[PDB]
Known about the structure:
This is part of a larger assembly, with chains A (55 residues) and B (54 residues).
Chain A: H1 3-19, E1 20-22, E2 39-40, E3 44-45, E4 52-54
Antiparallel strand pairs in A: 1-4, 2-3
Chain B: H1 2-18, E1 19-20, E2 28-32, E3 35-40, E4 45-46, E5 52-53
Antiparallel strand pairs in B: 1-4, 2-3, 2-5
PDB class: membrane protein
Keywords: membrane microdomain organization, membrane protein
Entry title: Structural insights into the membrane microdomain organization by SPFH family proteins
Amino acid sequence: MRKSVIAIIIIVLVVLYMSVFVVKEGERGITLRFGKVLRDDDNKPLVYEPGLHFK
Amino acid sequence: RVVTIAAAAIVIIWAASGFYTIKEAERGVVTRFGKFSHLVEPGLNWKPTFIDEV
């Protein structure tokens, strides 16, 4: 039960590191799943404020 | 049981090669066999390989 725990920990950490992305102050981010953009608040395109967000 | 394995392999290949994605700015025209079938919106979609083209 030693290889499995370190393996799950490292893969979880790398998955989280892949997931996180930061939008710089001067820019704004648009997210694309497959082709389309994410829609929110009654089918309105969403733009990310310059903060840390998860993908 | 080898025939069952072959059936599983071919159905898996059918499912995996059928999925396709089209960008948001784009719209897909899908034609069943050689005849136009419908229009697909910009998202992940599935089509029968060798049956219809996008």
